[PDB]
């Protein structure tokens, strides 16, 4: 759904910070329990950004901040440590 | 990511002109440096395990507080991860040597490694010292006199030393 | 940005291994072809303005309807002719970028990706750009390994647009 | 499924399989178990050597820089998955392998295969692999932190009934894999997926038949699913297009000669 | 997958014997013809869309039953499927030419393609006729003497014709 | 098995695209390397029995404990020496296969993958095979591009064992 | 999947001409029957749980071997799956009634249901009996004249009955 | 192939629940639209030959180079004119199928999916079909709900091509 | 939530496409049903207190054990009767909300999802609420278009509880 894919520049990584992930008729579909709703950090490449945004949006999550990384590696995520 | 050609391509496209004569002459100079570059990559790849092992051994000899019971490089798992990190740093410096541009080295290995190491409690000064020891081993095996036809190979050695210097600067 | 060195490093990173002699042979082919690519890009840079003007004239000769019929997508006015010359200059410049790089990576990242949305949204016929690339393929004047490399990018953009 | 069905079908261990979820602040044992479960399920129970174990994405999980989904994507986008399931396989087989590994499912219909083939042709292997992980079904079923597992033997919300019968044609057993000799496998679903039908399951103890005194010298039966057409000689009236033949060993070569002389095509031969 | 070298390697390793002198000489002759092989691959790649469009035009000119509503190639979706099948078959024929062995073309493309076309209702005879006219067009553009140095190329043309014939035979 | 031609076809197939000039350059480098690799494999085929016997003897000099100490994993008896000669013959034969193929793919798919389990399970020390490969580096007797490509394969199995 | 309009669209596109005036008049008659169709869907949906519970009660009344220890409907898991199966069969019958075509019922529910029930051990004759009991329950609540304006409803009742014997014939 | 009844059943199956009053409202809107859709399909069926010939003539009027320049993709000869008339009959026939069905599903399954590589491969300009669909806009003669329902399917094919 | 407009937009977003004439038919059915739903919700709002008290009395008549037996889950004291009237008020108010919305969306968001844990944790028999909703079905007083929309929601919560 993007022209970014099949491109080196489309491997630019970003971090989405999303809040408010809660059960809803849109979330009633999920087969697994969600454990955190405070501040979820997801690393997303450029090509995959459209998919991630829709996915976050479809579930009702609210995006607070998107931090650029200037790298293909997810090393400056540093949230699960 | 970029190499020695596509970095100049991306800069010329972002400025929106053709490559100038001096840019093509510098690219031809790196083309003349290419066989030296492939020899350096081949030598570093051929002695990479010895470089990692000897640099880790000398690093733990100079700083014994790392492998001490309770140190970061203690426990097979963490020591093994430290040897793995030496292999990753050496592999991406080899990648940057191969491409001629360090874009693979920052954009896939060095971007966020310092914040990761200070999150994990990994001492980045010892990692930088191990990168320095890997650098010394790499420039001794690249500039080895025997076993290869002679030539003035100072430019590729200086570029490799710059790659190791920015690898050590991105963890300390 | 596909390129022999970049695909070599990307593939060896995908296995996560050191650079074996397969990647060294990739580099050897890149270094032997890189000289002919560099003087091909130099010759096309020297002949760039004449090639762009001749390609625009060849497109206006094969497709005269762009010159008399009015519209944003057509080149009836000076604005449309300037846009067409800028487009052909973009095509030739990215072909020179591919000659410098040694692969269709500049074409993929800069021109080929999303060009269908360009030709659909702005009502630009891709056959115009195809005939511009055929003029560059017919009147650039390269020979040997330089011409075989340069035509390969010209037909690749032709194959992408057709 | 319950005990009596899964004991016959040989899918007991799939039904008593707990989906591994990598919780936050997990111990190295839990991360190792998640990595091993991903290597078992995404790489299709292959004997995975340590030389292609993907240490970088393993450290990215250990590091918590990537999620379980990212690790699954990294594994499926690696050259281990390309060599094992993509390069020597045809497109139908590769799409079925992607469904089994990433989504834990058999494909439901031919337009799904056409969509994935079109997406491969339009955007490469990377785009195609992403299609499965960045799908609504993956996010709902496994999401970011649950290791994918086979869901074809359970009742799913948006599933086709033919998916349950096709899951046995895709999942051959617990001690099976998706590797073949030469790493090139043909799809078992192309006859039905294209035609929107189903085959009998015949999995494990389901495949067995009663022998008695009719089995011949070797007390074993052979099971032949054969598509039958009208014979040119018109000697015997054909009553059904799809026919079942249970024949002994001592008549198996003769029966194959009969089916080949009748012009009928053999679709399945198994033990019974 | 296998190429002309790794097929030889696999056949030698199944016997567990080193390569003989004559088999190494056959590989050396393959390396000598490799330049012509790359030229033929480059020509079919550069004329791929022309070959596919011209052979599609010819195939639907001689076979109107694919054009009429109800025909397999009727509907933008199914005609796009026919066109991508033609580009797919051309791409894997060029891959088999590039490798020197038909392992990628047999295992990756033609494995189960006949039963796939039977089950979908695709007329494999029409696809085989399209493959034959792609063969005829591609062997015209490979054997074009203009714009290339002169030389005998009958071996690589016969190899390309063999890959095209095994592509048409594995479909119908 | 990885090879410049097979990896070029694999990368173009995973990208779902025709063979651009990048893969042509990869094949050009393979053709440049291939004659020297085939002649190096021919020379190692000619000197294989002397190299294998000398490598077994050199391992018995540097690691003498395999010769006196009894055990299934050692070469104290004739069976252990025969198994050691068979192992070194395998190592040199896969090296010649790598020289023929022009990549480390024979080493990966025949020897490197899973060798740690063979060394751990059967109590074989990898340092013995490392010393055997160092002997083969010492006395293969190749020159130029032949010795550079061979010693890459020799060091690739050395780095995988160490 | 198809409905009553897209089915005729499908074979009209297959034979490749416009819809005839008789087909448009038949679809106009379908539109006239559509309010009665929506009424039937609404009443079966409104009494779906009553239908499933009463049909399960009757089915396990005249077939006491299924609920008997060791029976297919014995155990909370198998009884929950059986009640779920009746609810899904009723759901897809309402789907096919709603569309006016049995494409959703045959393609997504009834395809492979005989093979699934043979594989599990589910007796298809018992499921066919339960589907039949659901058929008289649904046809009695559809043909109930209380609380609805009067009219001729034999066509939609015959269509619902046809979908119900389609469901009953696809398990046994 | 999307349609009010079909995607109503598809989404009710997606949450896996019975058909609530939402889907009944969807079917009620389908019923109030379907008589006008069937009348529009009947009127287009009776006027189809004149509409297709007039649309082809309007394309030839705005794009005369199709009738003059030689080429396989052009209508300069009788073969290209029959191909163009068959294409316009296809566009009108799937528009009538969309009027019968009540959604753009026949356009999606039969016409819209894959038409971009149809136009790219066979060098067909989508602006020709855009002008033909705008003639079908201008000259179908419908009024009321039948005109607006038909114009949805016309403009959907306009927005896909342009 | 489950509403024809929101489900239509959610489906068009699921395919990622513009609103075709299908969604316009969905909104047409919503518009023709919405006035009847609004007057039904107004009548239920105006008869709300009488309907809630009558439903509580109908439950206490059919289930008299909720009146005399002591317990938190029963209506033996005034607190239990107040909770029962509050529960039936929630049921009736969500039914009016569904009449206003045009789908079972308020029932899914507020009542249906999670009611099983309410009935198990607090020991509430769902048959009490099912008989209360039968009372609302019996005595809402609507006719024709209004009652069939309201009985759809009353049966939806009955079939969910049973
Ligand atoms: C003793 C039986 C034989 C022997 C041993 C020897 N070991 C090493 C070096 C290391 N040993 C370890 C092992 C561990 N580190 C851990 O954290 C844990 C878990 C708590 C274990 C089991 C490690 C990590 C090293 C290397 C780092 C270091 O030096 O500490 C050596 C030195 C090797 C060198 O090259 O410097 C030796 C000699 N050697 C023998 O001959 C005995 C038979
Ligand atoms: C050893 C005594 C013999 C032998 C073995 C051999 N096995 C394989 C491959 C596989 N073996 C299995 C078996 C299991 N996998 C499991 O997870 C379980 C537990 C339920 C079992 C029992 C599987 C699945 C495979 C294939 C997948 C994989 O390789 O992991 C091979 C490899 C064959 C190949 O060509 O790749 C071999 C050689 N071979 C012998 O000669 C001995 C007699
Ligand atoms: C008419 C407005 C202009 C014109 C048209 C023209 N079209 C073609 C060829 C094709 N058109 C299609 C289109 C469809 N096929 C379908 O199945 C459907 C859905 C039902 C559609 C819309 C296709 C597939 C082809 C190619 C295959 C074929 O020949 O049938 C041509 C011929 C192109 C060629 O190279 O042979 C022409 C000329 N040309 C004009 O000049 C008009 C302005
Ligand atoms: C054109 C010459 C003829 C024709 C073709 C036609 N093909 C299909 C469908 C498929 N073709 C394939 C083959 C491949 N797809 C791949 O990705 C690869 C390897 C890269 C191969 C070998 C497949 C898998 C399909 C099914 C998936 C899909 O539908 O896209 C069709 C569609 C038939 C249908 O409607 O179901 C058609 C029409 N048809 C002709 O008439 C010409 C002779
Ligand atoms: C007794 C305490 C009260 C009572 C009970 C009652 N139960 C049923 C019906 C069923 N009970 C079950 C339960 C099980 N089935 C199982 O397989 C297992 C696990 C081994 C359990 C726990 C089931 C499945 C049914 C329904 C199917 C059937 O009829 O067998 C009823 C009949 C309900 C009906 O509508 O026919 C009754 C009356 N009733 C009381 O009043 C007691 C206070
Ligand atoms: C596939 C494996 C392979 C490789 C890697 C390879 C490299 C290679 N390096 C070369 C040259 C060379 N290599 C060097 C390098 C050096 N000289 C020094 O004294 C320094 C210690 C050192 C820098 C690390 C020099 C100076 C030349 C000659 C100049 C040149 O050819 O560029 C040559 C030219 C032929 C020759 O004279 O040997 C080749 C082919 N050939 C192969 O087949
Ligand atoms: C993209 C390439 C890549 C990089 C660069 C990378 C680095 C990296 N190093 C890590 C850990 C580590 N790295 C070390 C390294 C050391 N400790 C020391 O004392 C020495 C100074 C040094 C080696 C010389 C240690 C000890 C850990 C484990 C930290 C812990 O678990 O407590 C981790 C955390 C996950 C894990 O434990 O494996 C990452 C992600 N991972 C990757 O995939
Ligand atoms: C990256 C783009 C690129 C390509 C593809 C390329 C191919 C290429 N083809 C060559 C030769 C050749 N090519 C042919 C091919 C043919 N001769 C004929 O008359 C037939 C019409 C035709 C078969 C299709 C022959 C006969 C040779 C000389 C023999 C040989 O070098 O193998 C050569 C040797 C140098 C030369 O003499 O031109 C190169 C470099 N060089 C490049 O830079
Ligand atoms: C496409 C829509 C769809 C259908 C049609 C469907 C049917 C279906 N019914 C199943 C099981 C079952 N179905 C029954 C049903 C019955 N047993 C009886 O004795 C009665 C005669 C009958 C009820 C009237 C039982 C008992 C099982 C469980 C079998 C077992 O686990 O052992 C299963 C096995 C997986 C599971 O347990 O969830 C499927 C897939 N699933 C679907 O997604
Ligand atoms: C969203 C909820 C909803 C629904 C479901 C609904 C259905 C509905 N059914 C109707 C008619 C009808 N319904 C029936 C049905 C029947 N007549 C019988 O005697 C049989 C017992 C039965 C077959 C099950 C008939 C005969 C008509 C009149 C003819 C027609 O309008 O098609 C009408 C026309 C208006 C009217 O006269 O009442 C509507 C609106 N309206 C709504 O708001």
Short mmCIF file of N, CA and C in Angstrom, two decimals, chain H residues 6-55:
data_model
loop_
_atom_site.label_atom_id
_atom_site.label_comp_id
_atom_site.label_asym_id
_atom_site.label_seq_id
_atom_site.Cartn_x
_atom_site.Cartn_y
_atom_site.Cartn_z
N UNK H 6 -23.53 -8.82 0.21
CA UNK H 6 -22.36 -9.68 0.34
C UNK H 6 -21.38 -9.15 1.39
N UNK H 7 -21.12 -7.84 1.42
CA UNK H 7 -20.19 -7.42 2.46
C UNK H 7 -20.89 -7.31 3.81
N UNK H 8 -22.22 -7.18 3.82
CA UNK H 8 -22.96 -7.26 5.08
C UNK H 8 -22.80 -8.63 5.72
N UNK H 9 -22.97 -9.69 4.92
CA UNK H 9 -22.75 -11.04 5.41
C UNK H 9 -21.27 -11.26 5.73
N UNK H 10 -20.37 -10.68 4.93
CA UNK H 10 -18.93 -10.83 5.15
C UNK H 10 -18.48 -10.19 6.46
N UNK H 11 -18.97 -8.98 6.77
CA UNK H 11 -18.57 -8.37 8.03
C UNK H 11 -19.30 -8.98 9.22
N UNK H 12 -20.54 -9.46 9.05
CA UNK H 12 -21.22 -10.15 10.14
C UNK H 12 -20.54 -11.47 10.45
N UNK H 13 -19.96 -12.10 9.43
CA UNK H 13 -19.13 -13.27 9.62
C UNK H 13 -17.76 -12.91 10.19
N UNK H 14 -17.29 -11.68 9.92
CA UNK H 14 -16.01 -11.23 10.46
C UNK H 14 -16.08 -11.02 11.97
N UNK H 15 -17.15 -10.40 12.49
CA UNK H 15 -17.35 -10.53 13.93
C UNK H 15 -17.99 -11.85 14.34
N UNK H 16 -18.37 -12.70 13.39
CA UNK H 16 -18.85 -14.04 13.70
C UNK H 16 -20.17 -14.07 14.43
N UNK H 17 -21.10 -13.19 14.07
CA UNK H 17 -22.35 -13.03 14.77
C UNK H 17 -23.50 -13.08 13.78
N UNK H 18 -24.71 -13.15 14.32
CA UNK H 18 -25.90 -13.19 13.49
C UNK H 18 -26.15 -11.83 12.85
N UNK H 19 -27.05 -11.81 11.87
CA UNK H 19 -27.36 -10.60 11.13
C UNK H 19 -28.26 -9.72 11.99
N UNK H 20 -27.69 -8.66 12.56
CA UNK H 20 -28.44 -7.73 13.38
C UNK H 20 -29.20 -6.76 12.49
N UNK H 21 -29.82 -5.74 13.10
CA UNK H 21 -30.62 -4.77 12.35
C UNK H 21 -29.77 -3.85 11.49
N UNK H 22 -28.45 -3.79 11.73
CA UNK H 22 -27.54 -3.07 10.85
C UNK H 22 -27.56 -3.66 9.44
N UNK H 23 -27.40 -4.99 9.35
CA UNK H 23 -27.43 -5.66 8.05
C UNK H 23 -28.82 -5.61 7.42
N UNK H 24 -29.88 -5.64 8.24
CA UNK H 24 -31.23 -5.48 7.71
C UNK H 24 -31.43 -4.10 7.11
N UNK H 25 -30.86 -3.06 7.74
CA UNK H 25 -30.88 -1.72 7.16
C UNK H 25 -30.09 -1.65 5.86
N UNK H 26 -28.96 -2.36 5.81
CA UNK H 26 -28.17 -2.46 4.57
C UNK H 26 -29.01 -3.07 3.45
N UNK H 27 -29.73 -4.14 3.77
CA UNK H 27 -30.59 -4.79 2.78
C UNK H 27 -31.77 -3.91 2.38
N UNK H 28 -32.29 -3.10 3.31
CA UNK H 28 -33.37 -2.17 2.98
C UNK H 28 -32.90 -1.09 2.02
N UNK H 29 -31.70 -0.57 2.23
CA UNK H 29 -31.13 0.38 1.29
C UNK H 29 -30.83 -0.25 -0.06
N UNK H 30 -30.40 -1.52 -0.05
CA UNK H 30 -30.22 -2.26 -1.30
C UNK H 30 -31.54 -2.41 -2.04
N UNK H 31 -32.63 -2.66 -1.31
CA UNK H 31 -33.94 -2.80 -1.95
C UNK H 31 -34.44 -1.47 -2.50
N UNK H 32 -34.21 -0.36 -1.80
CA UNK H 32 -34.70 0.91 -2.32
C UNK H 32 -33.83 1.41 -3.46
N UNK H 33 -32.60 0.90 -3.58
CA UNK H 33 -31.75 1.29 -4.71
C UNK H 33 -31.91 0.35 -5.90
N UNK H 34 -32.38 -0.88 -5.65
CA UNK H 34 -32.22 -1.94 -6.64
C UNK H 34 -33.18 -1.78 -7.81
N UNK H 35 -34.37 -1.21 -7.58
CA UNK H 35 -35.30 -0.99 -8.69
C UNK H 35 -34.77 0.05 -9.66
N UNK H 36 -34.21 1.15 -9.14
CA UNK H 36 -33.57 2.15 -9.99
C UNK H 36 -32.33 1.59 -10.67
N UNK H 37 -31.59 0.72 -9.99
CA UNK H 37 -30.44 0.08 -10.61
C UNK H 37 -30.81 -0.85 -11.75
N UNK H 38 -31.88 -1.63 -11.58
CA UNK H 38 -32.35 -2.51 -12.64
C UNK H 38 -32.92 -1.73 -13.81
N UNK H 39 -33.61 -0.61 -13.53
CA UNK H 39 -34.11 0.24 -14.60
C UNK H 39 -32.97 0.90 -15.37
N UNK H 40 -31.93 1.35 -14.65
CA UNK H 40 -30.77 1.94 -15.30
C UNK H 40 -30.02 0.91 -16.14
N UNK H 41 -29.90 -0.32 -15.64
CA UNK H 41 -29.27 -1.39 -16.40
C UNK H 41 -30.08 -1.75 -17.64
N UNK H 42 -31.41 -1.73 -17.53
CA UNK H 42 -32.26 -1.96 -18.71
C UNK H 42 -32.10 -0.86 -19.75
N UNK H 43 -32.09 0.41 -19.31
CA UNK H 43 -31.94 1.53 -20.23
C UNK H 43 -30.58 1.52 -20.91
N UNK H 44 -29.52 1.20 -20.15
CA UNK H 44 -28.20 1.06 -20.74
C UNK H 44 -28.11 -0.15 -21.66
N UNK H 45 -28.84 -1.22 -21.36
CA UNK H 45 -28.88 -2.38 -22.26
C UNK H 45 -29.53 -2.03 -23.60
N UNK H 46 -30.64 -1.28 -23.57
CA UNK H 46 -31.27 -0.88 -24.83
C UNK H 46 -30.45 0.16 -25.58
N UNK H 47 -29.73 1.04 -24.88
CA UNK H 47 -28.97 2.09 -25.54
C UNK H 47 -27.49 1.75 -25.70
N UNK H 48 -27.10 0.50 -25.43
CA UNK H 48 -25.69 0.13 -25.31
C UNK H 48 -24.92 0.27 -26.61
N UNK H 49 -25.51 -0.13 -27.74
CA UNK H 49 -24.78 -0.10 -29.00
C UNK H 49 -24.51 1.33 -29.46
N UNK H 50 -25.53 2.19 -29.37
CA UNK H 50 -25.35 3.60 -29.71
C UNK H 50 -24.42 4.29 -28.73
N UNK H 51 -24.48 3.93 -27.44
CA UNK H 51 -23.59 4.53 -26.45
C UNK H 51 -22.14 4.12 -26.68
N UNK H 52 -21.90 2.86 -27.03
CA UNK H 52 -20.54 2.37 -27.26
C UNK H 52 -19.97 3.00 -28.53
N UNK H 53 -20.77 3.06 -29.60
CA UNK H 53 -20.30 3.68 -30.85
C UNK H 53 -20.06 5.18 -30.67
N UNK H 54 -20.94 5.87 -29.95
CA UNK H 54 -20.73 7.28 -29.69
C UNK H 54 -19.55 7.56 -28.78
N UNK H 55 -19.32 6.70 -27.79
CA UNK H 55 -18.16 6.85 -26.91
C UNK H 55 -16.86 6.61 -27.65
#
